[PDB]
Design a protein around this ligand. Structure first.
Ligand SMILES: NC(=O)c1ccc[n+]([C@@H]2O[C@H](COP(=O)([O-])OP(=O)(O)OC[C@H]3O[C@@H](n4cnc5c(N)ncnc54)[C@H](OP(=O)(O)O)[C@@H]3O)[C@@H](O)[C@H]2O)c1
Length: 159
């Protein structure tokens, strides 16, 4: 199946100027945890921000244009992207905006990081219907020495 994985600040804010407007090492770990040994579909935008494959995962990028790193796989359509995954149990969609927007409808689950920070962004997470999903997990964390904001992990499934 298909899964989305994002970290949202206040107001679904997900990025600014091609970046994540905060720094939460703790999130990094949860992300790795959740994407380890899975294929990951990402947008060219996001790809450019990462700048190198994610070990432990099949990296599939979406671009109209042609590939620019032989180490990762390129694609020109949502169905091909999906194709490229193969017969895997969970495909992970890692953003950016436009991509979330697209796979959203197709998703059966989301993995969220709710971060208590109010920041301006140029990208926000697709609006979804609270009714359609069922929160099956939550895990609160207070700000800390390294994580300057408290945040909460959560997991929803399509109702
Ligand atoms: N907060 C988080 O959880 C999280 C996770 C990821 C990213 N982000 C943030 O996301 C922001 C950028 O997201 P974005 O929406 O600007 O870009 P994106 O989705 O990362 O990149 C979009 C690009 O992907 C290509 N694309 C998308 N759908 C396609 C399709 N069906 N076929 C072909 N190409 C397709 C297009 O590239 P072409 O130019 O090649 O057509 C498009 O310009 C950044 O700020 C990043 O930091 C946040």
């Amino acid at each position: 199946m298909i899964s989305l994985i994002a970290a949202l600040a206040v107001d679904r804010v997900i990025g600014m100027e091609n970046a994540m407007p905060w720094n939460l090492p703790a999130d990094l770990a949860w992300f790795k945890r959740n994407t380890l040994d899975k294929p990951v579909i990402m947008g060219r935008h996001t790809w450019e921000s990462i700048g190198r494959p994610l070990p432990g995962r099949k990296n599939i990028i979406l671009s109209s244009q042609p590939g620019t790193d032989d180490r990762v796989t390129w694609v020109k359509s949502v169905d091909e992207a999906i194709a490229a995954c193969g017969d895997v149990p969970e495909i992970m969609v890692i953003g950016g905006g436009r991509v979330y927007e697209q796979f959203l409808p197709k998703a059966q689950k989301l993995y969220l990081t709710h971060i208590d920070a109010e920041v301006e962004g140029d990208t926000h997470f697709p609006d979804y219907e609270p009714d359609d999903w069922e929160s099956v997990f939550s895990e609160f964390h207070d700000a800390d020495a390294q994580n300057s904001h408290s945040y909460c992990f959560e997991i929803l499934e399509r109702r």
